[PDB]
Design a protein around this ligand. Sequence first.
Ligand SMILES: *[C@@H]1O[C@H](CO)[C@@H](O[C@@H]2O[C@H](CO)[C@@H](O)[C@H](O)[C@H]2NC(C)=O)[C@H](O[C@@H]2O[C@@H](C)[C@@H](O)[C@@H](O)[C@@H]2O)[C@H]1NC(C)=O
Ligand SMILES: *[C@@H]1O[C@H](CO)[C@@H](O[C@@H]2O[C@H](CO)[C@@H](O)[C@H](O)[C@H]2NC(C)=O)[C@H](O[C@@H]2O[C@@H](C)[C@@H](O)[C@@H](O)[C@@H]2O)[C@H]1NC(C)=O
Ligand SMILES: *[C@@H]1O[C@H](CO)[C@@H](O[C@@H]2O[C@H](CO)[C@@H](O)[C@H](O)[C@H]2NC(C)=O)[C@H](O)[C@H]1NC(C)=O
Ligand SMILES: CC(=O)N[C@H]1[C@@H](OC[C@H](N)C(=O)O)O[C@H](CO)[C@H](O)[C@@H]1O
Ligand SMILES: *[C@@H]1O[C@H](CO)[C@@H](O)[C@H](O)[C@H]1NC(C)=O
Length: 257
Amino acid sequence: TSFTRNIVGRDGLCVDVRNGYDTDGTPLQLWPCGTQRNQRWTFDSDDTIRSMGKCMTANGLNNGSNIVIFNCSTAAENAIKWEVPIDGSIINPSSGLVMTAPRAASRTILLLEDNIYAASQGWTVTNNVKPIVASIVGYKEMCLQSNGENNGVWMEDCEATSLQQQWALYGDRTIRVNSTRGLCVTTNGYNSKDLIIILKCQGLPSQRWFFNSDGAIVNPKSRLVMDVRASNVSLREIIIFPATGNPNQQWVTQVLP
Ligand SMILES: *[C@@H]1O[C@H](CO)[C@@H](O[C@@H]2O[C@H](CO)[C@@H](O)[C@H](O)[C@H]2NC(C)=O)[C@H](O[C@@H]2O[C@@H](C)[C@@H](O)[C@@H](O)[C@@H]2O)[C@H]1NC(C)=O
Ligand SMILES: *[C@@H]1O[C@H](CO)[C@@H](O[C@@H]2O[C@H](CO)[C@@H](O)[C@H](O)[C@H]2NC(C)=O)[C@H](O[C@@H]2O[C@@H](C)[C@@H](O)[C@@H](O)[C@@H]2O)[C@H]1NC(C)=O
Ligand SMILES: *[C@@H]1O[C@H](CO)[C@@H](O[C@@H]2O[C@H](CO)[C@@H](O)[C@H](O)[C@H]2NC(C)=O)[C@H](O)[C@H]1NC(C)=O
Ligand SMILES: CC(=O)N[C@H]1[C@@H](OC[C@H](N)C(=O)O)O[C@H](CO)[C@H](O)[C@@H]1O
Ligand SMILES: *[C@@H]1O[C@H](CO)[C@@H](O)[C@H](O)[C@H]1NC(C)=O
């Protein structure tokens, strides 16, 4: 079977065939999301991803290789097969390299690169091309709240009127301050007990998050998950820590009006 969607990534821009051209070798880029046909990608059972009747194609299979559109019958088979890991990567199975947006700007050309679990390598396959805006409810049924750039995130009692409890869940798998969308939830290191803060979005692995089926919020590079330190909300510290399933690591998203 097949179905068609946009592909949203870095800074909420979309995977777009450059200029709408369908000539073999036309690179893929970031561009503001829209309905144009060169942003509509059809996913088939054969592991191809197609726009304008042609296939997303690795124009080479080394670090830094370009990703292009190319005739599906004449391209190399191992260059047109893709899988979509649950954490939001888009991977070429033959090479193991993943789709990457090396810069945030529109017209940035997409490349295959070694997987470092960066936010530049996060994508979401969807027809809703706007970030989802939600409260993130956790331990003691409190809400995750931001407190300014460079400051910690922490738990507060949930308030419909607290804008700092409002999070934009971007397609690149970042968690952004909804009223200041250039700022991202960021782990301040990849080791256990490292603090979670707000920092300018820079596409980093420290800024990538995965909402898994167990109710954890996982940082893929470290493997560690968001944790209310010591189960003590009055410490006003959220850390990364190995997944335990304990209440201080359980979260849900609740969409906002
Ligand atoms: C795969 O390609 C990447 C993009 O070119 C490399 O990362 C970039 O490496 C540059 C040095 O050659 C460096 O100035 C860029 O800032 C960096 N971009 C970022 C932020 O990832 C990557 O190179 C590896 O990682 C970088 C950061 C350095 O540590 C290099 O020594 C590494 O080789 C390439 N990866 C590999 C394994 O070839
Ligand atoms: C992908 O390349 C194929 C091989 O070059 C194209 O098929 C060829 O299209 C030629 C020019 O239209 C035509 O003379 C031949 O009939 C045909 N050759 C083969 C091997 O099938 C293909 O074109 C599409 O598929 C063919 C079968 C027809 O249905 C065309 O109308 C299609 O455009 C190329 N695919 C695309 C999307 O360009
Ligand atoms: C989250 O932030 C967004 C972006 O600033 C807010 O969305 C704007 O809201 C106004 C009022 O409805 C609209 O006129 C704009 O079109 C919106 N802009 C965008 C880019 O969507 C939003 O209200 C904030 N809060 C919530 C709950 O989403
Ligand atoms: C419809 C289409 O092909 N759109 C393209 C094209 O857009 C240029 C202007 N803005 C237009 O709407 O016609 O080129 C940009 C930049 O390369 C994108 O590829 C866009 O999707
Ligand atoms: C929780 O943190 C506050 C601030 O450090 C501290 O005063 C309090 O004793 C802590 N609670 C427990 C049970 O350790």
